[PDB]
Amino acid sequence: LPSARWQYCGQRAVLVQFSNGKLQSPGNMRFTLYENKDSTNPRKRNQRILAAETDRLSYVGNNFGTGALKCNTLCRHFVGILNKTSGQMEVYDAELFNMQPLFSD
């Protein structure tokens, strides 16, 4: 019955939810994330956009618009690491992004 010391250390590690399938073959794929300017009003704490550069398509992931998922607001998402020699499951705040390929207008 294994245990793990819960050492909460604090940054928000992104997690990806592809609307196409599973990313099972990673390769040359560039990932960049975007944050709003005005940090004054409390909407900047949720405004974040993740962009995915592939040569074929570009995948974009929101937190606010129509299609942004409700699993990271009605429930929190954490990330365990479990440095096995020390035996401490150190925990990071996380978000899940449901990515959707961009086409046109």
Place this chain on the structure above:
Amino acid sequence: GGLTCASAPQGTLRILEGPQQSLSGSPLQPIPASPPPQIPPGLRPRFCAFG
């Protein structure tokens, strides 16, 4: 600005509020049954036959 991918996640944990056992161990509370109708005390012949 890398954001390189990592390996597959090697386990999930689900945390939720568990129900208490001490509220789960109580015996039942039946409604007490009303008694069957009993003969009211102090009954006697109030009618003597005429004449």
